[PDB]
Every structure is written in C-alpha cells, then in structure tokens.
Amino acid sequence: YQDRDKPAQIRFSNISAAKAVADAIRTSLGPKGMDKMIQDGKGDVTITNDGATILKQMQVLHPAARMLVELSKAQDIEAGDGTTSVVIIAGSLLDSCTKLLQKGIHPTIISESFQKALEKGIEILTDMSRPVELSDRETLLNSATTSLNSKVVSQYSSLLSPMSVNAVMKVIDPATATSVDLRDIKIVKKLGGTIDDCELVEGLVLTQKVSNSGITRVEKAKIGLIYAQMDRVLREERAYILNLVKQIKKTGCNVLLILALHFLNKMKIMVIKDIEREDIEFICKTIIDQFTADMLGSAELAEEVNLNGSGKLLKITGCASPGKTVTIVVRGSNKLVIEEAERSIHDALCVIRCLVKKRALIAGGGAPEIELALRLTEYSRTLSGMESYCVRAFADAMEVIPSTLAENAGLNPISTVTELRNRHAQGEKTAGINVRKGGISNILEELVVQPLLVSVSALTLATETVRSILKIDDVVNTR
Amino acid sequence: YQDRDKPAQIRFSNISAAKAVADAIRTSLGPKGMDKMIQDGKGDVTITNDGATILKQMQVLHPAARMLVELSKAQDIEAGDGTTSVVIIAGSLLDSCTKLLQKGIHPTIISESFQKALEKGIEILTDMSRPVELSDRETLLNSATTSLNSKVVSQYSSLLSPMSVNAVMKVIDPATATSVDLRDIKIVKKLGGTIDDCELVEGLVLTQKVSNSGITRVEKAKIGLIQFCLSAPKTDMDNQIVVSDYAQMDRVLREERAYILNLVKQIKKTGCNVLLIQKSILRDALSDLALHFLNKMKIMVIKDIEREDIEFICKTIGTKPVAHIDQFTADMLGSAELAEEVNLNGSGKLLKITGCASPGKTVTIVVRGSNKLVIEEAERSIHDALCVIRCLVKKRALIAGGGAPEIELALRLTEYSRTLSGMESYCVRAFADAMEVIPSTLAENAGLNPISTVTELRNRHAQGEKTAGINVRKGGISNILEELVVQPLLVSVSALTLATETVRSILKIDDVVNTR
Amino acid sequence: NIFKAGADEERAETARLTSFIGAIAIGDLVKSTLGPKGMDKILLSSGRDASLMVTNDGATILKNIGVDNPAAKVLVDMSRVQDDEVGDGTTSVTVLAAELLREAESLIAKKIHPQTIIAGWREATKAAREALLSSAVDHGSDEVKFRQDLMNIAGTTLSSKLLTHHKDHFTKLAVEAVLRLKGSGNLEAIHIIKKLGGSLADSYLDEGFLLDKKIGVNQPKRIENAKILIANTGMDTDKIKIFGSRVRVDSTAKVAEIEHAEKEKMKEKVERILKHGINCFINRQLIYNYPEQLFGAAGVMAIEHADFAGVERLALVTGGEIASTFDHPELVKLGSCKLIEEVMIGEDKLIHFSGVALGEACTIVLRGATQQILDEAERSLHDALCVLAQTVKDSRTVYGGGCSEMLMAHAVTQLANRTPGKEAVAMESYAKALRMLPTIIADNAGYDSADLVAQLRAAHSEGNTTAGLDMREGTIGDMAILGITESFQVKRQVLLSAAEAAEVILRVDNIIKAAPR
Amino acid sequence: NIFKAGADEERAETARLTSFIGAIAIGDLVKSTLGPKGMDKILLSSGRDASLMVTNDGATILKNIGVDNPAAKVLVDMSRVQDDEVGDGTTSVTVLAAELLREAESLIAKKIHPQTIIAGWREATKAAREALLSSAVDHGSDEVKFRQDLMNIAGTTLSSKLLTHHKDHFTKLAVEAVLRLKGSGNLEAIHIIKKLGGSLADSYLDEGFLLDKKIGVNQPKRIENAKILIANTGMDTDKIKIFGSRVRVDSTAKVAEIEHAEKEKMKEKVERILKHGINCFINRQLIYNYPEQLFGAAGVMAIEHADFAGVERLALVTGGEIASTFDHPELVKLGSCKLIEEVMIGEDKLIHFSGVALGEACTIVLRGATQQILDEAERSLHDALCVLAQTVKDSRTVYGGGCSEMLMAHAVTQLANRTPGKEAVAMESYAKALRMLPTIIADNAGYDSADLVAQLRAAHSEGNTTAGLDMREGTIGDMAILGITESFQVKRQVLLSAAEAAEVILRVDNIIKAAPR
Q: Are B154 and B227 found together in one domain?
C-alpha cells in the first residue's frame, strides 16, 4: 500500500494521551490501592488515594484526555460511585482498538460493534443481579453500612446510615417514584458536639443569624425572595427605604430572603441575608415593582435555635407547600470530624439513589467484569463479519478491573483471573476477589455488594466516550 | 513541465563541446590569422597557424568533439583545402540551433530543414560560379599559383604550377574522367640543388642505389618484385644448425653459398636483369655472400624498398610480387626500355627506370632542393597543387574568395525563408545568419571592424555581384577578381555538404550509452 | 526589488501551485464529513479553551475557520451562499469543486492550456445538466406519492446530523409543516419554538401559528374578532434609547412628578392606539403595567417583548402591517384573526392564533435538554424546510446516494466520443470528479469504495438508471425501492456552482498581494 | 547477520521497485528509436575507442548492452527471441511491455493485488485477439493484389534504416526473391552477397545462386555439365592447422625432398578426386597453383575457401553430400550442375551457377560504399525476407501505423464495462498501454501526439476502422489508400510476447541473490 495521507497519526495521539491518564489512576483502584503523592505548584505536598481528586489536579491540556476527566465527573453526578473504575475501563478499550486499527478495520465498524456489545452487556448484568425491595429499610441499612465500611469512617457508618434512609424515604414514596433529587436534602455541619447527636428536620435549617434584628420569632410567615438639609436627607433616606418596605407590607410577606434594621423590626420581619444561590434552590423548591404575593412561600413557625454544638441555626418547620424536603443537622468535635461525616452522607445518598432508579444488587471484587467477559466471548461466536473480533476485544478489555484488584491484594494477577473464569463457568457471579482476607472467596458471604446502576452507568458512559473518540478524524485550531 | 527523461542535457553537452573546438581554431582562419602556442605534455612547444595540425594535437575525449576532427579529415581527402572553414561553419550552425531548441522545435524538423537549405545552397553557388574549360592550361596554371601563394612557399609556386598540370594531363584524359586518383603520382625529393629544377618521369624513380652491383646501367631490362629474402638458409619452422668441428664449419659454409647459388641460377634462367627486393625487418633481406654471386651473373641489385613503392612499381612498369624463388618466372616479370642510375651534380644518385612500354598511366615528379625542410615544403606545395587541379576536374567552375560566396549565400537564403511556411522559416533563416561568421572572421584578422564590414558587403552583393569581398592584403573592401583571389567550386560545395551531414548527425543523438 | 516589504507576487509557476494547494486543502478538510457515516471534527480556538466542540456539519466548520488565501477565499464564499440560499449541499459544492481543481492540476503538468480545459468543462456541463432533466420524475397528481417523496427528502436532509436518530418522528413534523402551507415558499410563515425539557421525540407541532413568547402578567385567555396592529416604540418608561440625558431630582416629590409625567405620556400614547379601533396591540418593547391595565380595560390584548422576526412574521400570518407610527389613526392596514388563545407547552405561556387570514401557516415546537441541542435542532430543521419549500415550487425529483452523480458522469463519457483532440482529455477528468462523490461516501462508511463504485459504472452502462449505493446493507440496490431521493433544484445548483467556482481559479494565473497595512 | 558474504535479498516493496525500474529502464531506452523518424543513439564500449558507432536499430542496442538486474534479463531475452523467430517488432515488444509495467506500478499504490491485475490482462488479451481477426483481410484470389501488399510489407520493414534513400528499389528485390521460393520459410536457400563499389540502387537479383567469393586465380569462365563434389581437407599445403609436428631434414638433398613430396601428396589427392571422373571440385580450404593446373588440364574447375555456411547451402542446391573422404570412389554421393559462370560485380569475381537442383533458390547482391552499409543492409534484408515468408504461409494482413494498436484498445475499453469492479481498472490500464505506441511514434516525428492520438480514438470510436497515422504528410489518413500494412503473424506475436513478459515480472514480489562465483 501507500497511505500518503495519515489521519491515523492523530488517532494514535488521542489513544496515547488517553491511555496515559488511565494508566496513572489504575494503581489507586480498590481499598488496598497504593497512595499517591501530589505536590502543588506552591510547594505544598498532599497524599490521597481518591481518584476523583487526583484527576482534577492533573491539569490536562490534551483535548481527548479532557474527555475522560469530564467522563469521571458525569459518573459522580448520576451514580456517585465507581469514579476510578470508569477511567480504567475506558482506557483498556482504547488500548484494544490499537491492535484492531493495525489490521485495517474501520472505526465506524468498531464504533457500531461496541453498541451491540453494550446492549448485550446490560442484559447479562441484569439477569444475574438480585432483585430487592425499596420499601424494606433493613436491606437499605445493610447495603449502606457495608458500603461505608470500605469508606474512610467505618465506625460511625451505623449512625449516619439510618439518617440518610429516613431522609430519602420521607422525601420519596417507597416503591413508587423512580427519581430522587439529592438537592432536596440539605446537610448542615457545625463545630462542637459529637456525631452521636443528629437531628432530621422536616423543614429547612440555615446557617445565618438574624442579627442585628431582634425579632427572632415570626409565626405564620410568608417567605419570599428579593445642616438642616443634611438632616433632611437622612429623613429622605428613611423615606426611600420605607417606601420599598410599604410595598412588601401590602403583600403580607413576613420574611425576606436577601437604618433598615429598625424598619424591618417595626413590621416584625425576620432578616435572612447573605444566602448562597445554591442554598436558595433548596428553599426554592421547598416553599420591588415585580414583587407580589403569588411568588411568596409559606411557613408555620420561624425562629433561631442556638445550641452548644450546633451553633446558630434557623429552624423553620411547617412550610405547608407542595413538595418533599428534609434537613440533616450534623455535629462533631473538629472540622475534620464533621467533614468526613457529611462526605459519608453523600456516598450514602448516592448508593440509595442508585437503588431507587434500579432495584438490584450485584457482587463486587471484579465479579461483574469476569462474568461479562465470559459470556461476550461465547456471544462473539454467533456473530458474523467484522463484529467477531470487535466483541472479543471488548470482552478481553474487561479483564483489567479484576487483574488490578488482584495486584493490589498481593496475589498473582495472571493466575487469579484465570482461576475465577472457570469458577464463573461452573458457578455463578458470587465468586470474586476478597481484599479483606487476601484470597479468592465467595463475595456473597462477605456482604460486599454494590447497586446495579454503578456497573450499568460505567459501561454506558464509557462506551459513548470511546465511540466519540474513534469518530474524531482530526483537530483544527481556529481563531 | 516535467520531463522525466531529459535528452536536452546531452544535446547541450554536445553543442558546448563542439562549439569549444570551433571557438579556438577560428582565430587561425586567413593569411593574417593569429598563431598559437601548443605545449605538449613533455614540455615541448611549437608555433603553427595550420588548423589541421592543431586538431590532431587537441586529444579530445568528448564524442561530439571527435566527430569534428573526423569532419576536418574528410575535407582534406576530397577537396584538400578549406579545413578550417568547415570547422567554423559546423560550430556556428550548432550555436544557432541553441536558440531554436529553446523555442521548442524538434531536431528532426530542424534536420530536415537544413537539407532543403543545402539543396538551395548548391544551386546559388552554381549560378554565381564562372564556368571554365579544363583543357585550357592558362587559367589552370594561375589557379594553382594563386592557391599556393597563400601557402608557405610563394616564390616557387610559379614554376611548380605547370609541372603539376603536365603530370595530370598525362595520366588523366582531358575533359573525360570525372574522378582523378592522385595515388598514381609520386614525389621524389633529394637534398642539393633547387626547386626550380623539375623533371617529370614517365617511369618510376627510387632513392636507393645499385649497391653492391657494379653494373649501374641496363638497356631493355626485365624487372620483377621478389619478396623472398636472399640469404643463408633459414626456415620459419623450428630447426637447428649443428656446428661441432672444422669439418662441420665448412659443411655449413659451403651449403650457404650453394643454396644461394641455386636461387641465383633460377633468376638467370628467366633473364631478369634488375632485382627489386622489398625491405623486410624480420630477417636479413640481402647478405654479403649473395652480393658476390649476383655480380657474376651481371644483374642489377636493388634493395631497401618500402612497401609503398612496391604497389607503385607493380602498376607502373607492370611487375608482379614474388614471395618465393620457385614461383619466380617470366609470367611475373615486367620490362622497361631503360633502367639505370642517373647521377647529376646536386640531385644525388637516383634510379631512373623509363620506357615501360605496357598498359597503364603513371608519372613521377622529381624536385631538387637545398635543405631537407625545403624539399618537404615543396612536396606539400605540389600535393596542394594537385588537390586544386583535382577540384577543377570534377567540377569546372571558379568562385571569388575572401568570404564572397558567404554573403551571397546568406543574402539569398533570407528571401527563400520568406516564401516558405511553417518551421522552415526560422530554421532556414538561422542557417543563413550562421554563414556570416566566415566574412566576420576574415575582417577581424585584417584589422577592420567585423560588424561594419559585413554590413557594407550585404549592400554591395545586393546591388552588385559576387565581385565584392574582403581583401586581406590591402586591408579593405575591393574587387576580389582584380586582386587575383579565386578558389575552385568543389571546396565551397563540399564544405556545405560535409558540415551539414555532421550537424544533422549531432542533432539526432539523444543519449550516449557506455557498454563493455 | 520589484515587490518588497509585505508585497508578494507569486510567479506563473508558484501562483499555479498556490492557487490549487490552497483550494484543495479546503476541500480535503471537509471531505470526511460527506455522507451519513461521515467523521466528526474538533474545533478549538487558539488562546481560548471554551471554544471546544464537536460537529460533523460541513457548513459550520467553514464559517468558523479563517482563510488567508484569496484563492481559497472564493471557494469559502461560494459555500456560504449554498447554505444561506438553498440550505443543502454545502459539503457537496466544496468537495466537487476541489476534485475538479485536483484533476485540473494534473492536466497542466501535461502542458494542456487552461483556456482549453475551460472550453471542455463548458460543453460537459450542458451534457451533464440534460442528463438530470431526462431522469427527473415529478408528480402532478397522487399527493400520497408527493407526500412520500417529501418524507424521503426530509429524512435525507436530516442525515449526518444530531437529529439523525430521531428523524423518523421529525419527518412527520417537517413534511406536515410544508404540506399545510400549500402555496408560496415563504419560510417566515412557519415559526420555530425552542423549549427546554423533554427528549427530542417530545417535539410537538401547532398549525395555528403558535408564538414562542409570553405577553403581560394578567391577560384574557380568549378574544373574539381581534384586530392585529403592530407598532414600534418604547411602551415602558421615558428616555427610550436616549443616552446622555439626565433628570434633576431634589426630593421624593420630584420622583412622584416623573411617575405622573410617565402616566401622562403613556396615557397620550394609549389614546392614539385606541383611536385605531383595535382589539389587539403588538410592540417590540416591553409594556408597563399601567398602560397594560389601560389595554385590559378596553379589551385590547397587550403583546410585548417582540423581536425583529416577530414584526415580519406577525404581519403576513395575520394579514397586518408593520405600522411603526401609530400617531395618525386609521391610515394603516389591520390584521385579521379569529381567536387568540393561551396554550402552555413546556411550562411557559405561549400565544396561539386561530382563523387568521391565509391560515396555511403553522409552528413547530422543539424539545431538548439544553440550548445547544435546540440550536443544532433548529439549524438541521431549517435546512430541511428550505429544500421542502423548493420542492413545492418545482416537484421534479431525482435519486440520490450516488445515483445522480454517476449518471452525469456517464453522459460526459459518451460526449468524449465525438469531440476534438484536446477537449477529449479535459472532459474525462470532469467525469472522474463526478465519480469521486460516491467514492468518498463509501470510504466514510468503511465499505470498499473500489468495489462498489466500479460496479455502478457497469450498472449504469447498460440500462439500470436507478442503481445506487445502499449504506444500510452495504450493497447496490434500487434507489426507488429504498426510498432515497433529493430535489432537482439542489442537484442543478450544486452542479453549476461547482463548475463556476473551479472556472474562476483556472482563469487566475498570478496572485498580486500588496503591502499589508 | 542474516544476509552476507555476497548473498542478498530485497524486501517486498524494494524488490517491487527493483523489478519494475529495472524493466522500465530498458523500456525507456529504446523508445527514442521507435518509428521511421526514430532518433539515433551512441554506443561506446569500455576500453576500446574504436568501438564508437551510431545506430537507430533497437535490436542491436539491446544485444550489446549488458544487463545487471535479473528482472531485466527476462525482458531482454524475450526481445532476442522476437528478433530470431520473426525479425520484426523487436522494439515494439520491449516498449509495449514497459508500458504495461509502468501502469501496473501505479495500480499497486492503489491497493490492487497483483493476481487481480493478471486476471484482468488475460481476459483483455482474448478481446484484443478477436479484434484483429475481424480487421484482418486476406487474399484468396487476385495475386496481383497479394503481390502489391508484399511491397507494402517491405517498405514498412526497411523503414528507419540507412537504406531509406534507395529503399524504393529494394521493395522489388525482397518480394521477387520470396516469390521464387514457394516453400518453407528457411532462408538458407537465398544467399546474401556483400560487395563494395556502386550505389545501393545498383543492387541486382540473381536466380542462379550467385556465390559470395572468388575461386583460384586463373579459372575457366564457363564449363559444360560440371559435377559438384564437396570435400574438406587442405589442397594447398601440408600440415593444415597442425602444430607441434616436425619433419627431420639431414642435408640439402632432403630440403627439396619434403618440397617435392608436398606436391606429390597433393597430386596423389588429385588422382583420387579424378577417380570419380567429375568435372568440378569444391573444398573448404584453399588450392595451390600446382593442383589447380592439374584441375584445369583435365577440365576440372577449382573451387576453394567454401565456409561452413557455403558447404551446407551447396549440399541442398547441388543435391550432393559433404563427402569428407574422397579417398575411394563410389563412397559418397556427387552433385549435378549444368553451367558455372563468372560475373564481376563491385571489383570482385563472383561464381554463378546454372541448371542446378532446387530452382527455387536465388541470391540478392548488395553494393555499397563501405562495409558498415553492407552490414546494416544485410540485417535489414534478412529481417525483410523472414517476414515475407510468413506472409506467404499466412496471407492475412492488418493495417499498421497506429491503426491496429487503436483497434485492440477500443475492444478492451468496451469489455471494461462488461467486467466486474476489480477487473475493470486493470483492463483500462491495459488499453492505455496500447495507445502509448502511436503516441511515441508521433513524438519521435516532432508532431503533436496529444491531437493525433486523440483524433484516432474519436475516429475508431464510430466507424472508420482503417484510419491511421501518416508520417509523410504529418496528418491522419486512410491506411488502405496510402498503402501501409503489416503482417498478421507479426502483430499477433508482438501482442502475446508482450503480455507474457509483463506477467512474469508482475508476479515476482521478491528477488533472492546469491554470492557471485
């Protein structure tokens, strides 16, 4: 042949730049993964094994490799778990496409072949899953507790798990609604006290103080979001301020969401100001010329409760407005105590959110990847044409996940994935790698499970990224 | 364009290599031409204006430059004059073809165009030529005298002219044979005397002697050519002569004298009175013991004869070569009326054999002279005179010299180029403009303006006739016929024909390939 | 020292290569996007990382990229005219014009004079144009067959786009919008609405010319015999589009005087509006609540926040007039609308008309997750409405997918049989460029081009004028049965524009660039 | 260290260039000599300056030039067989074979497998042969028209030679000698004579088998009823081609004894020759004067110096035998001859025969100025007489001068549409190589090949199968009227030998070289 024009040079540049990112984060997979040392440009040195944090500190200038960075962010938004696993899977797929492109297979044939393997891969993981009931709070407690044990705090996971379950079951109808909004649950952490003290508030709890306004209590509140001449101007400044208050008073708004301190006290209006926009969205769904009564919310009793360890908080209950919202109050000795307490709540809410959309449980420890690679090999024998080798390359790329967990466990990566493949042939998905005992063991008895949405979204989002990279012919720099 | 294959690089190499030869030699054209210094690789130097001698010392390795050397040699064989004129014309044509090749004209069209111009060129020179009678010896005498006036010796060209005319009229029938073979005329030159003394011998003349034979004169002699060396017995096959004691010494000595005597008796039975022995460098041609035996039979003995004379003696007196004594008989023998050795005052001892009385046409010119260099230049003067006479025999006509026919040729071909069509308009015109290099060179060596002189001649030839030209003796434009400058027509016709065939051959060469 | 200090002129040898290399580089850039299987491309501006994006549209790539070559600039300008006027074939014009110049460069190396090549392409253009006219098949009757052809053309235009997956539902939207028109091909009559939320399959359609905009605060939901009058002026407050003018305010009473002066100025404006005797009012500027109550008290519907596209469209759909000056009453023409009702689609208040004069208009309501999806959905839909409106004017249709491009190349080949010497070679390269379009389509699909394209030559050689390429099964079949066809005006426009674009490049043997300022 | 010590092997793509460039370099060498206007070339051997010469013959150029690459040795050997078997079209085979590989080299860069190209050339070869059969017109009657066509064959074969001037006279000499044959194509029955003197137009034709060389010195001019007997031995002197043998001689008495016995041994052989009682004798060696007188005294003609080419020709003409042993009579078969004459042509004595067996034999006498002209005229005449032999065996003739080459290319082009995809491109390159032959002929004549070749393709496209190129007038005219034709056996052999030669080079992807010995 000739191949004078070589567009594949950019293809190989995109694969090399994308594989370099997946090869780095690979060693951080699993609880036993090795820690990494990141040094900031200012000279600060930090050590963390979290994959989502390292990818943000890499400062990736390459366009194709930035797609994997955005791929990890899309995984945390939907499922919220398995950030490191997605980057590793997407890296092994592009590495397998290198051997296929050298054989002369066209990318569109490769791209369309992964879609058929993806549709078949979803059916395999679904049939082998374990259906569970969403209305049962015993499974939700055990699935969250065992999942948070592999997280940072394994001791207090038993306390924070029912706080997240009772919050979701309150804002979501059990076994009815398939969609859960994580922004409908607000977590407030303050210094002082201990994690043993937690309060689930059906209303909203904020961080603001009503100072210097001394009303501090408003019942049945409608909340809404919005030398002689020298002395005369001071009287005119009070007129302009009171003018805008008169229009508010006609509508009946007793609480405003932001010299005027005294005018708001005469009208018995609680002062809530310095509020973040993201915090307003939580209040938006819960409860001057354009200001009217129709845009006002509702409330029962507003007040500021000052405790020893929870600081100054605004407790507003009985909103009486269409919606379902709750609030969680978190206490703890130091800042790192309440920091990891809230981070464990986000991980708890994401796992519960995955169980609401898809009700199922699958084993961990590399089990879903080996069973997937086992059935796709037999499924590739029935296909004809170029789809035969493309599916086998998609199946063999699933071996990177179990081989990585076995490598971080000290075992032999080559001998482990070989023995497990025959265990799934005769047995079921229950077989897998147990990192706690350091050897091959039944994962079902180890009580290590993960929701189905984590594995399904991992294959769905990574495949769309791999197909998007292969379809790129070149890059053009405009101005 | 692209031109993956580039034959033009070979064409440009051939033209540049051929033009470089004509650029050097052009300065030697004319009687006033400049001289040159030729330094041989050994350090020896010499000064000569002859163009033919310089080209032999060039040692050109380029193929196109070698064909010009062969072109100058072919001109001396046919006409014998105008050697430098052919090389200059061959170099000027290729220079004008360079401008045509850049215009994108293919050489085959250029090669076919020069042939049509050559056809018209011969007709133009024919009409301008003045027909003369070959039987008239008055004009023929002044033709050889004028041609030899520009040669080395201008003093003796007067007396040597009729000597060459009478030699041709004897061996060539006047107004009959179109071709004349100059190989039937030989020149014998000896030291002493002067060139003014000339003797045309109807027979053959040799520079050897009758030594050791003391006869020196024979009347009604019988002559034959013996190629067999007369000496002691010797055989080409491997043999040996065993000499042991005095008995075997006389046994060999008596047989050497008996073997030679048996060979001499074979000559005496045939009646051959003159023995001409060819010179042989392999073995001794004649020994001392044979000299004693050949004197008893009273037979003239002559030896040391080159092979070139053997071919002349065969045709002259009617002899035949004899390679072995057994084959020697009366059938191979010739005859003559008088064969002897004529010794004059300063002409040396010459062998005069006359009165062959057989069929044939032969003549021999004997010219004396003081210095060995004087007799050699006399041979060149007679040889050049015979070449000029030969030109009038084949073609009877006379044309003016000094670049006169070059202007008339270049002027008329311009008018013919206007009547034609196609590529022949520029190709014939380039052939015409290249004819002005000959008169431009003669005006440069004469101390005049080359550009202004050619311009005036084109006007004089337009209104007048061929008489206008360049006179190198007076250094100005004058009547060529009144200045006694004339050249035969064959020199100018053969100059255009031979040069055209070489230029066309060079244009047909795309590439050179080396084999092994 | 002929041209120095910024002034450059390429000689006949260099300006020859520079003209083609600059033009061929443009054609080779977008050639990968031809066909439904075409490749994508990444566009990133230098110095700004927020310009990252991926699109397979050949028209979008040529607009954002800069061109420093005047020879390539002509080819880019001819591509933008193709997208702005006809709307389809932007990639086809660029690729076909580049292939003509790529083959013309090889003919110049053969010492073929450019003027001779131009004389050959002019004769081959007429022969290739008559081939489409003989193969064009229209339908005077059988609107079912005419409507089915519109669905095939709409599905073909939507190919290689963001909507290509859901296009099956969109063919019913685009054809019905044009089918209800049944008249002049004015596209202003068909409004396009872009709303957030819902998938692409949730896009609705309204035949009563639904408005994308909401009016007022409290407005009547129904009105009988509403007269449409458009006006252009600020209805909100004083100092409209006036910069540099201030007002001295020494106290609060001065502000109340401005409020009284504002209500006094608005009252005089409402009076002149009511002198027209209209039941509805339209203006581009927003309407303040005080004149809104003056309109609601008299029954006049207050319409505000109109754009430049609204005044032009609201005039022809309702049969009204722009009427920028409402000062002199009853000197302007008023629109005719039977009913104006409020319809909520996408959690937004929208305006729905009924029984308007020439009510053949309609509106398509797009549904998408973000604005970037809606913007690309409108560009893909608007390009489809252009060729469908052209199909109503000229109902002649031809078969696409390599069928029409190969048929024209066959007619040029037969023309090469009767021709003088030099024009024979020139027209052969013209026929080879027409066969490059079905060749590039097969390359972007992974199929073997040399096998499929060469069989089409033997197919159209003896009979079989309907043969073509099938991207679905990767084989050759009937284009009439598979339902792949395009309009006739598109092929004639791409064929002539590509011939005129490549003709200008050949006529330029030298490029003179002056000294930049 | 896999390949060393002189043994090397070239890789796939490298031997692909090594095989093609080696063959194309041989092709590009002889292209300048193709045609009657073909350019000349210079051949200079290394170390010998006297080897400088010039020739336009393509066959002579290929024989003297050594070949290095083994791939080019196959192409040269196929050209040598073409010259020995047929004698015409040696250059046409090499040039046509080079054009096939030059086009095939561009097809490999297109990813066309070599085996696929071979399958295309085989099917295109059958179509090229069938096109010649319909165009070939033989003569079953009207021998005058057959003899007129024979003169056209001589004019084409003798073109591009040094004989072009007087060639018009040689057209009659070549045809007359073949018409007297009326038998197998063996040319040993027709003798060739090379003598100096006179012009080319003075060449005669003798039907009595005029010999090459003279005999003896004094010989009878005419003898009545001479019996022919060939013998091989020295009749001149003793010890012929014998080295190392010596004879011992004791004294002067034995010096003559070996001299007289030398004549006695010859006279003893003369007595044994006359035992047959014949009138004439022929020997390969020379004849001394003493046995020559013994021959003339008894009425026996002395013929000497008959080479190996003579003794084989004298055996069939005279109907005799080589007869190496004359020692005893009636051990050999003698010959029969009526009259033996002597004709002097070009200053030499030639021996004429009359009244001999095989009256179909004849001899052509050549006369020229130098030996170089006689050598070139011999190969020109030998090639002409061999081609005319096939015209008598097969009377079918075709029109040359670009007419036959374009007809075959037209049939391949029509077949390219009836063939599937991959075999269509391979046939077009095969038909394109056939159009390269008339193109090179026009280039060597200084004309425009772009116009002339294109007009022929348009002429043979519709009717006018007899159109061809006219080199004399520089235009296109009818070949039947201008009297230009070529043999069918020659064109059929050039077509097949060129296709088989290009098939071997294309099939070889690798070259294995060993260590030189």
A: no
